Ligand binder design. Structure first.
Ligand SMILES: CCc1noc(C)c1Cn1ccc(C)n1
Ligand SMILES: [Zn+2]
Ligand SMILES: [Zn+2]
Ligand SMILES: [Zn+2]
Ligand SMILES: [Zn+2]
Lengths: 76, 68
């Protein structure tokens, strides 16, 4: 029904929000510290000097294990 | 249709995975450091000395700003 299409759209949008803001391909699994923005995969987060969201200096990257992780890179 | 019911269940399970594993009421927004388990809201995370997933000591809690 049309209701099925509405639910599919909601699911798709939530799943897209879980992807890296730089490559758009890998799941987010890294936090810029100390600001806390958690918007990149490990590869894309590795070379950024400053946060792509708030411009704060990145002192280090903290890896995050989330319950919503479903990619092979994060389930292994 | 039956697919509407299946999709509602998938959405419910994804939304439950986004909620704190301790209180089940508030969204996850906190990481236990250094282990990295990101499974609690700020109120439950503040009250735990050990990670509830891996039992590692919590040195400190990092707030996470997620696209959620
Ligand atoms: C990076 C995780 C993420 N980004 O967008 C959504 C939606 C998520 C899923 N998520 C896991 C825990 C929480 C609060 N949201
Ligand atoms: Zn990336
Ligand atoms: Zn930031
Ligand atoms: Zn909680
Ligand atoms: Zn842990």
């Amino acid at each position: 029904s049309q209701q099925t299409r509405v639910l599919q759209e909601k699911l798709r949008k939530l799943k897209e929000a879980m992807l890296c803001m730089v490559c758009c391909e890998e799941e987010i699994n890294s936090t810029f510290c100390p600001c806390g923005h958690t918007v990149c995969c490990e590869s894309c987060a590795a070379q950024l000097q400053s946060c792509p969201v708030c411009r704060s200096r990145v002192e280090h990257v903290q890896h995050v294990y989330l319950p919503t992780h479903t990619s092979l890179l994060n389930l292994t």
